[PDB]
Amino acid sequence: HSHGLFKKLGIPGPTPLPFLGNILSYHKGFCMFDMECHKKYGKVWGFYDGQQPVLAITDPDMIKTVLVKECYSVFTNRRPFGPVGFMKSAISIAEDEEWKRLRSLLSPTFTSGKLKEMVPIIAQYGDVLVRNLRREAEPVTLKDVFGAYSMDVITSTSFGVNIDSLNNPQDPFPFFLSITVFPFLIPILEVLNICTNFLRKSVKRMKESDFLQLMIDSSHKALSDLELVAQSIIFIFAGYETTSSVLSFIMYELATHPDVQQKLQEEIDAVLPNKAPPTYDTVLQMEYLDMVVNETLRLFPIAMRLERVCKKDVEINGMFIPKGVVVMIPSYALHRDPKYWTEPEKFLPERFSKKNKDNIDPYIYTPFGSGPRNCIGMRFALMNMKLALIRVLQNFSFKPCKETQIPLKLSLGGLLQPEKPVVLKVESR
Amino acid sequence: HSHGLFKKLGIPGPTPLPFLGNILSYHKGFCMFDMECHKKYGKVWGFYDGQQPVLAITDPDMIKTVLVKECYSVFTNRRPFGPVGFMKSAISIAEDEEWKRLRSLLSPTFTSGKLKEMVPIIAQYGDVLVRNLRREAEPVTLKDVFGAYSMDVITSTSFGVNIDSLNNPQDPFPFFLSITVFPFLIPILEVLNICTNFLRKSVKRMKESDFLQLMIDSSHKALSDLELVAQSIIFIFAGYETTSSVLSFIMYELATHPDVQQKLQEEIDAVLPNKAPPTYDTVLQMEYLDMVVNETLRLFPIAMRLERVCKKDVEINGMFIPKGVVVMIPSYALHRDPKYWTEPEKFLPERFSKKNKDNIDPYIYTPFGSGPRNCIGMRFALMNMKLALIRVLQNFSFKPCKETQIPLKLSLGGLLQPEKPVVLKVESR
Ligand code: HEM
Ligand code: HEM
Ligand SMILES: O=C(N[C@H](CS[C@H](Cc1ccccc1)C(=O)NCCCc1cccnc1)Cc1cccc2ccccc12)c1cccnc1
Ligand SMILES: O=C(N[C@H](CS[C@H](Cc1ccccc1)C(=O)NCCCc1cccnc1)Cc1cccc2ccccc12)c1cccnc1
Structure with missing residues (x-):
């Protein structure tokens, strides 16, 4: 069918098989597929997820045109996910005009000062972590401890609840993607009644009569109860998973690089002497800390792929793109590209130093994306x-263990998840 | 699911049943449904074809906004038909940018002078009709004789072929619409390989090395062989069916109204004395002839329903319409509306006289539609x-028979087709 598209465009790529397209080459994960295609075909190439044509671009100016220059008019939406039901109205899933409203509706949640009156609430949960951390079983599953914290902070910044997750919490947060081959079955399930339930109303209950309160405020600017919940489901998952997952990845690199973990611990002692309480302005000046989370986001991107659906015919940077093609930016392949990073498989936070910050193109390293559809909770996640x-x-040191996977191997599937959990030996001072 | 839409909009209509919506009320044809809904709910009402919300409008200013004012930006497309395959690129089926190109590509086919150098070719096939008509079996199936002619003229104006259809022609030109209830199965069949074949290449053969020649001319302005054929399939069907079907409907009203048939035959004798050959300018001045084909198009519209898919949220004439709603204009119900026509079930061509032409609103009587997506072959069909x-x-008179259905009843399904064919007794002079 559409498998002759990239042939007619003069665009190279792996020759697709009938119906399946190129999905068979995902047997080592799409990142390995993106990197190998990046080396065999160059700056641009096309392939097929089933019968869906996907155009991969690695040129920075062209990437900037897709994510920024032609976002509102052409590349407004990502690949349509489903079946979801009422979750179609979630901001990270909605399209065009409905998303444009949801973005403007939820933008003021993480402004400059909106995060400043969060730290007094976030700081309290920090101690709860150091208390549950101070346990002396003289490794530790870094994910659960970080997940307990990250759930406690996003359920508190969005709504009013604290949860010492030493006991059981209620947040219940795969291997199913046949649609990517055969998505024409999504409209089948949109009427087959396919979707949350416990949380589909547990959130809905919230009346409180602030993310929750800056929404019940609900002129072409309304918000149903399900809409309230649909945004809450996204904010809760993103605040729990993305935070905890990256935190565990950061700790893995700190344990396997004692010089970086030690130089960072020196940075926290100086700027915050006598273990002073972390304020909103002390975080924003620890420079080496910023480099450490930045370099970890390079080697372990949560996206791995950035994508935009072409909504109408375009010619960008001297190349025509038809409607309905998914334009993909292989962030993982670009973050590991030896053409933009020397020894790219190595953990070196000096890439983001004061002098080396200029050599980085902001359209090759895009851990939060860019443009109007970038990560809306980027600054909340960074803070x-x-x-x-x-x-x-400030209190603990982290160290490898016999129950630690070294070198850490990432699930060769479709998620910035490790094969084995990060279990590090925690030591105290 | 979406069945609560019109309830939340304050818009009345028949209460839908699960999954089916309101399709059950089509048991007397959608025209009867449109007329009865027009009388029970007023100027605007909504219903559901399955789970597809359809908004019916009868206000002329609002209809003008949909068909004309907001065509390019909002109401660019009709209901998506399928499964078709390569026929998706046919002009009457394509959408937005692809249709916008196909319209500009095929517009010059029926200009002012483009039809003027057609009459010398069309006139020859007229005699072929009067020859096959002069047969004296002293009724006649009006459709076959008209269909033989209308196929001979559109296959000649578009490509080079004549066909005395006294013998067998090759044009082979239903009752299947489950999709209207359950259309989510269309993308299933777009990959299940569902569609022409004989004609899918019989047309393709055309090389000729003029509709065919003004296309092989095939910069973002190309046309594949299938595209050539896909437009040819539409032009052939429209030139054969629409012409012959309306011609037979006109003859039925002329046979059942001898005064109109006689007054019209007087009109042809005067303007064209001694049965002078019909030229391009003699047609354009027979005024009563124009009234007769106009009044027949009122009682027997080929559309019955005009429809546009709402592509983005709009507020037109003080009413909000969400994306994805099909806006329907019930042409048949409006053509038979006693509020705009006195005794609307009667055949009275004087409604379109010189003085009575002004009382007709061009957005209540729309046999060819209006706006950028109107009937592109309107003037070719009228000529x-x-x-x-x-x-x-000029040669024959037409008269009822024992094998004639009087009063003629239209298929109560979804087609301007009669229940029984128009079989009239043809007499000569
Ligand atoms: C380390 C932490 C995080 C990373 C690396 C990350 C990464 C991303 C990326 C790559 C995108 C897509 C950008 C694009 O396609 O151009 C995105 C979108 C989004 N992020 Fe995050 N994210 C993080 C944390 C969070 C948090 C804490 C929230 C809290 C609400 C959040 C909410 C969202 C939403 C709602 C979107 C969709 C925005 C839209 O569709 O308009 N993210 N994020
Ligand atoms: C009595 C004869 C005819 C009638 C009553 C008629 C009626 C119509 C109507 C109601 C529409 C839709 C307009 C709208 O939705 O606003 C249409 C569209 C169209 N007609 Fe006809 N038609 C006739 C003959 C023809 C002929 C002879 C052709 C020859 C090519 C033709 C080609 C088309 C095409 C291609 C479209 C679609 C235009 C587009 O999608 O841009 N029609 N017609
Ligand atoms: O993942 C698909 N689309 C997505 C859009 S839906 C997806 C559904 C979902 C809901 C609840 C839990 C888990 C998944 C969704 O809401 N996620 C973002 C919600 C929270 C979050 C996570 C991470 C960074 N920030 C924010 C596009 C998308 C948006 C934002 C961030 C993303 C990060 C990685 C990958 C995709 C991303 C997809 C997959 C296969 C086929 N078609 C579509
Ligand atoms: O009929 C559907 N859509 C249609 C768009 S496809 C339809 C498919 C088809 C191809 C070949 C033979 C018969 C049908 C198509 O090409 N016709 C126009 C082709 C010739 C023609 C006929 C009549 C007046 N002029 C021109 C919308 C549409 C366009 C133009 C004129 C129309 C007249 C009456 C009704 C619909 C019309 C539909 C039905 C159910 C569900 N969804 C969609």
Whole structure:
């Protein structure tokens, strides 16, 4: 069918098989597929997820045109996910005009000062972590401890609840993607009644009569109860998973690089002497801390792939793109590209130093994306993580163990998840 | 699911059943449904074809906004038909940018002078009709004789072929619409390989090395062989069916109204004395002839329903419409509306007289639609029909028979087709 598209465009790529397209080459994960295609075909290439044509671009100017220059008019939406039901109205899933409203509706949640009156609330949960951390079983599953914290902070910044997750919490947060081959079955399930339930109303209950309160405020600017919940489901998952997952990845690199973990712990002692309470302005000046979370986001991107659906015919940077093609930016392949990073498989936070910050193109390293559809909780995630990295390193040191996977191997599937959990030996001072 | 839409909009209509919506009320045809809903709910009402919300409008200013004012930006497309395959690129089926190109590509086919150098070719096939008509079996199936002619003229104006259809032609030109209830299965069949074949290449053969020649001319302005054929399939079907079907409907009203058939035959004798050959300018001045084809198009519209898919949220004439709603204009219900026509079930061509032409709103009587997506072959159809009505009435008179359905009843399904064919007794002079 559409498998002759890239042939007619003069665009190279792996020859697709009938119906399946190129999905068979995902047997080592799409990152390995993206990197190998990046080396065999160059700056641009096309392939097929089933019968869906995907155009991969690695040129920075062209990437900037897709994510920024032609976002509103052409590349407004990502690949349509489903079946979801009412979750179609979630901001990270909605399209065009409905998303444009949801973005403007939820933008003021993480402004400059909106995060400033969060630290007094976030700081309290930090101690709860150091208390549950101070346990002396003289490794530790870094994910659960970080997940307990990250759930406690996003459920508190969005709504009013604290949860010492030493006991059981209620947040219940895969291997199913046949649609990517055969997605034409999504409209089948949109009427087959396919989707949350416990949380689909547990959130809905919230009346409180602030993310929750800056929404019940609900002129072409309304918000149903399900809409309230649909945004809450996204914010809770993103605040729990993304934070905790990256925090554990950061700790793995700190344990396997004692010089970096030690030089960072020196940074926290100086700027915050006598283990002073982390404020909103002390985080924003620890420079080496910023480099450490930045270099970890390079080697372990949560996206791995950035994508935009072409909505109408375009010619960008001297190349025509038809409607309905998914334009993909292989962030993982670009973050590991030896053409932009020397020894790219190595953990070296000096890439983001004061002098080396200029050599980085902001359209090759895009851990939060860019443009109007970038990560809306980027600054909340950076602050929530850095507030965590500061207090946990002011008190503890982290060290490998016999139950630690070294070198850490990432699930060769479709998730910035490790094969084995990060279990590090925690030591105290 | 979406069945609560019109309830939340304050818009009345028949309460839908699960999954089916309101399709059950089509048991007397959608025209009866449109007329009865027009009388029970007023100027605007909504219903569901399955789970697809359809908004019916009868206000002329609002109809003008949909068909004309907001065509390019909002109401660019009709209901997506399928499964078709390569026929998706046919102009009457394509969407937005692809249709916008196909319209500009095929517009010059029926200009002012483009039809003027057609009459010398069309006139020859007229005689072929009067020859096959002069047969004296002293009724006649009006459709086959008209269909033989209308196929001979559109296959000649578009490509080079004549066909005395006294013998067998090759044009092979239903009752299947489950999709209207359950259309989510269309993308299933777009990959299940569901569609023409004989004609899918019989047309393709055309090389000729003029509709065919003004296309092989095939910069973002190309046309594949299938595209050539896909447009040819539409032009052939429209030139054969629409012409012959309306011609037979016109003859039925002329046979059942001898005063109108006689007054029209007087009109042809005067303007064209001594049965002078019909030219391009003699057709354009027979005024009563124009009224007769106009009044027949009122009682027997080929559309019955005009529809546009709402592509983005709009507020038109003080009413909000969400994305994805099909806006329907019930042409049949409006053509039979006693509020705009006195005794609307009666055949009275004086409604379109010189003085009575002003009382007609051009957005209540829309047999060819209006706006950028109107009938592109309107003037070719009007000329091709009037050129036929002139010569066939210059020689013959048409009269009811025992094998004639009086009063004629239309298929209560979804087609301007009669229940029984128009079989009239043809007499000569
Ligand atoms: C280390 C932490 C995080 C990373 C690396 C990350 C990464 C990303 C990326 C790559 C995108 C897509 C950008 C694009 O396609 O151009 C995105 C979007 C988004 N992020 Fe995050 N994210 C993080 C944390 C969070 C948090 C804490 C929230 C809290 C609400 C959040 C909410 C969202 C939403 C709602 C979107 C979709 C925005 C839209 O569709 O308009 N993210 N994020
Ligand atoms: C009595 C004869 C005819 C009638 C009553 C008729 C009626 C119509 C109507 C109601 C529409 C839709 C307009 C709208 O939705 O606003 C249409 C569209 C169209 N007609 Fe006809 N038609 C006739 C003959 C023809 C002929 C002879 C052709 C020859 C090519 C033709 C080609 C088309 C095409 C291609 C479209 C689609 C235009 C587009 O999608 O841009 N029609 N017609
Ligand atoms: O993942 C698909 N689309 C997605 C859009 S839906 C997806 C559904 C979902 C809901 C609840 C839990 C888990 C998944 C969704 O809401 N996620 C973002 C919600 C929270 C979050 C996570 C991470 C960074 N910030 C924010 C596009 C998308 C948006 C934002 C961030 C993303 C990060 C990685 C990958 C995709 C991303 C997809 C996959 C296969 C086929 N088609 C579509
Ligand atoms: O009929 C559907 N859509 C249609 C768009 S496809 C339809 C498919 C088809 C191809 C070949 C033979 C018969 C049908 C198509 O090409 N016709 C127009 C082709 C010739 C023609 C006929 C009549 C007046 N002029 C021109 C919308 C549409 C366009 C133009 C004129 C129309 C007249 C009456 C009704 C619909 C019309 C539909 C039905 C159910 C569900 N969804 C969609």
